[PDB]
């Protein structure tokens, strides 16, 4: 059990350690796309880049670029695409991304300001009367509904591509109580949160894959689709015990860097998935 490996590193006090193993191994792959000069201002930081062989291409012929990868899980069966929160400049490619990508849901894991800082532009509309149009990519976005709870905050968006006027719906989920320092005591909130996204559909196969993101998306990004994807796992397979979450880490790793940003989101992540696996195995 995934847990006593758990207890095993609490008691040998070996987090760190535990996590910067994990930076060693982990893949390193060539993200020259994004180090274009005519993409620096398409990066919000010079540190966190899409990887080439698994970034999101848009469909334009002038820049394609968008910081977003492709997480593709094989034997889970789930997709993840992980961008950062968009910029002043990148509203319209994310929107742009998720029409093309036919994604049913956008899952944003930061607030947009964060210790006194811009963490994000405002890239949907906070007034069903004020909606937002982007016009370099010809989309138009209205706020439909908005349901607020203590520890998130579910929209319904309404996207509309002004080019044929077909619209779709996207669901926004919005945590909006991760820490601004360090993890929660409990993943309480957070699983709660993760078994909403999923009771969307926005997880489901017939849609695009979801779009996570955080201010880098990687931290608390990866956090949350390597949790999904350890449960998906666990209850799939003939024998769950065999889900070790480090090679889920790493096989993830191999789509977008950095995934999971300190020793701190590691132990939360296993927490996480261990008291998620009580759900999952029958209760």
């Given at each position: 059990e995934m847990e006593k490996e758990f207890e095993?590193?609490?008691?040998?006090?070996?987090?760190?350690?535990?996590?910067?193993?994990?930076?060693h191994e982990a893949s390193d792959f060539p993200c020259r796309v994004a180090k274009l000069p005519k993409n620096k201002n398409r990066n919000r930081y010079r540190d966190v880049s899409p990887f080439d062989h698994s970034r999101i291409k848009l469909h334009?012929?002038?820049?394609?670029?968008?910081?977003?990868?492709?997480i593709k899980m094989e034997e889970a069966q789930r997709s993840y695409?992980?961008?950062?929160?968009?910029?002043?400049?990148?509203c319209g490619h994310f929107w742009e991304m998720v029409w093309e990508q036919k994604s049913r849901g956008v899952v944003m894991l930061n607030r947009v300001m964060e210790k006194g800082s811009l963490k994000c532009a405002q890239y949907w509309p906070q007034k069903e009367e004020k909606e937002m149009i982007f016009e370099d990519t010809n989309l138009k976005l209205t706020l439909i509904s908005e349901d607020i709870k203590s520890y998130y905050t579910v929209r319904q968006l309404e996207?509309?591509?002004?080019?044929?006027?077909?619209?779709?719906?996207?669901?926004?989920?919005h945590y909006t109580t991760?820490?601004?320092?360090?993890?929660?005591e409990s993943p309480a909130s957070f699983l709660n949160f993760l078994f909403k996204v999923?009771?969307?559909?926005?997880?489901?196969?017939?849609?695009?894959?979801?779009?996570?993101?955080?201010?880098?998306?990687?931290?608390?990004?990866?956090?949350?689709?390597?949790?999904?994807?350890?449960?998906?796992?666990?209850?799939k397979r003939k024998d769950p015990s065999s889900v070790d979450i480090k090679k889920v880490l790493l096989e993830m790793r191999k789509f977008r860097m950095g995934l999971i940003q300190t020793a701190d989101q590691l132990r939360f992540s296993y927490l996480a998935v261990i008291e998620g696996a009580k759900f999952i195995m029958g209760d």
């Open positions: 095993q590193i609490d008691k040998s006090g070996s987090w760190a350690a535990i996590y910067q193993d994990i930076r334009q012929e002038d820049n394609d670029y968008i910081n977003a990868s492709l695409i992980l961008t950062q929160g968009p910029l002043p400049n990148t996207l509309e591509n002004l080019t044929t006027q077909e619209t779709r719906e996207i669901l926004h989920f991760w820490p601004d320092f360090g993890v929660a999923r009771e969307s559909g926005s997880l489901s196969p017939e849609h695009g894959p979801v779009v996570v993101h955080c201010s880098a998306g990687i931290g608390r990004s990866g956090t949350f689709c390597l949790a999904d994807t350890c449960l998906l796992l666990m209850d």
